[PDB]
Structures are given as structure tokens and as C-alpha cells.
């Protein structure tokens, strides 16, 4: 009972990430009672329990000598168990400012245990503090949401 999706998105655009769900694709894997709703952009968990949920976010500078700021993932649970606006899992990655030394990429990983309800719909939202957001893109095949069950 585990899943791993690969974000389709490449441009840094505020709003929810779309995901590759077909397990014939490299990196992607769905099993058990886990499923992706293409319309709502949500992973749907059938069997309840506690899961180790993790997401990964790699970014690449695509316009040499330009682009700075920050990019953020946020995992939101629908329906809202909290019923406030609080993210279940959250990550922020600094985009370094194009120095002579120059680092042209940026990683970020987080994971933790989440008690998930039956029929819980997990979705991920991208937000970005743009100072030339066009100069950076999501590294393709690298932005990943994954989980696996710990409770039997």
C-alpha cells in the first residue's frame, strides 16, 4: 500500500500541481487503494491508517545569470481535518541569486508520518516569491510526492 507520483509541471506558476499517475511511466507507482483524480489533481487514499508521506522538489535555473527568490510546496488535505488552512506537509527552497560561483539548482526534501482518513484526498500547491520566476523551472521528473503505509 504505497504511491509515488511525478509532477507534470515545469513552469513556476502559483496553483496546484498536476501529476503523472500511469505506472508504465518511470518513477510513477500506484498500488492498493490509492488513486489519482485527473480533474481535481488529487491523490485519493482508500484504506485509512498512518503513512510516511514525503515530497521532494528540485529546481533548475534556465536563464543563465538571472532569477532569485523562493519556491514552496504545500500538501493540503481535503476534506480539511484541521478546518483552518494549515498544511500537512510543507517545504520551501531558496533560489540562489546567480553569483560568479553560481549554483544553478536547488533541492528540498521533507517527510513525516500523517494519520490519513479513509477516502482522504491529498493535493499539493506550488507558491513562488518571484524575482524573475521565468528564470527558474521545476526540474523534470524530480518533483515527487510519495507515501507508504506504516500501520497494518
Amino acid at each position: 500500500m504505497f504511491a509515488q507520483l511525478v509532477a507534470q509541471n515545469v513552469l513556476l506558476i502559483d496553483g496546484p500541481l498536476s501529476w503523472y499517475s500511469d505506472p508504465g511511466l518511470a518513477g510513477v507507482s500506484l498500488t492498493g487503494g490509492l488513486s489519482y483524480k485527473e480533474d481535481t489533481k488529487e491523490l485519493v487514499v482508500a484504506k485509512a491508517g498512518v503513512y510516511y508521506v514525503f515530497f521532494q522538489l528540485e529546481l533548475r535555473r534556465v536563464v543563465a545569470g538571472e532569477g532569485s527568490g523562493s519556491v514552496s510546496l504545500a500538501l493540503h488535505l481535503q476534506p480539511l481535518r484541521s478546518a483552518a488552512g494549515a498544511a500537512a506537509l510543507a517545504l520551501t527552497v531558496d533560489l540562489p541569486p546567480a553569483s560568479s560561483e553560481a549554483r544553478n539548482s536547488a533541492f528540498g526534501f521533507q517527510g513525516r508520518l500523517l494519520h490519513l482518513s479513509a477516502g482522504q484526498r491529498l493535493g499539493v500547491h506550488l507558491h513562488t516569491e518571484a524575482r524573475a520566476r521565468h528564470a527558474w523551472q521545476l526540474t523534470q521528473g524530480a518533483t515527487v510526492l510519495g507515501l507508504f503505509r506504516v500501520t497494518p
Partner: protein
């Protein structure tokens, strides 16, 4: 093994018992024996598509006009070189000492030596000497 039998353009589908399923939309495999197809490259933003993605091979990007490719496989774009610069393998580096460039997308010519020409003189990275 069973999977080795499957060619390029397909994968050894382990969910549907080793059968050579074709690569789904937006994916490819340029070798045989693969258990999954790889995701097709997207050329968006500053990237334009140069070659479209088949199920054989991956797509390839070029830069939109006003920029130029840099690094292997056009890994990133760079804006076309300004007044005092010249385009190299490593990018728009500034003209060296004794050389200059007047126009955009140009080459580093050397300063006119007025001593060698008879007359008398200074130059810079973006302008020839006046004599």
C-alpha cells in the same frame, strides 16, 4: 529474460504480466528491455521545441529568439551578448584587454593601433580607440 524481448517504443508491463505494452502518452524508450518508459521532455518558458517527442526518442529543445543555448542538450539559455562581450562555449564573457566589440552579437576585434598606422592616440571593452 522476458523483458529483454520487448523493443524500443514499448515496456515490459509488470502489472499486466510481462507483455510488451506501448509507451503511454508523453513517454518514450530509445532502448529495449525497459520496465517503464521515460517521461518526454517539455520545452516551455524560454525553451522552444526543436524536435518533437516520439515513442522512440526524447524531444530536444532550443532557446526562444533573443537567447542562445548553453551546455550540453541545451541545458540552459542565455540572453544574446551585449556591447562589450563575445559568445564563448562558457557563455558571454567580456572582451579581453586590447580588444573591443561595437555591436550586439559580435566578435572581439582588437583596438586600431594608431602607432602602427602613423598617427597618435584610448580604447575600451565596447569602443575602438579614437586617433
Amino acid at each position: 529474460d522476458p523483458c529483454s524481448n520487448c523493443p524500443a517504443g514499448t515496456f515490459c508491463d509488470n502489472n499486466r504480466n510481462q507483455i510488451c505494452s506501448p509507451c503511454p502518452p508523453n513517454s518514450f524508450s530509445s532502448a529495449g528491455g525497459q520496465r517503464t518508459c521515460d517521461i518526454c521532455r517539455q520545452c516551455k518558458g524560454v525553451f522552444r521545441t526543436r524536435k518533437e517527442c516520439s515513442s522512440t526518442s526524447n524531444a530536444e529543445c532550443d532557446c526562444t529568439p533573443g537567447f542562445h543555448c548553453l551546455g550540453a542538450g541545451c541545458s540552459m539559455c542565455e540572453q544574446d551578448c551585449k556591447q562589450g562581450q563575445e559568445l564563448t562555449k562558457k557563455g558571454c564573457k567580456d572582451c579581453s584587454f586590447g580588444t573591443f566589440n561595437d555591436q550586439k552579437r559580435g566578435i572581439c576585434r582588437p583596438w586600431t593601433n594608431c602607432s602602427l598606422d602613423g598617427k597618435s592616440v584610448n580604447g575600451t571593452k565596447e569602443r575602438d580607440v579614437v586617433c
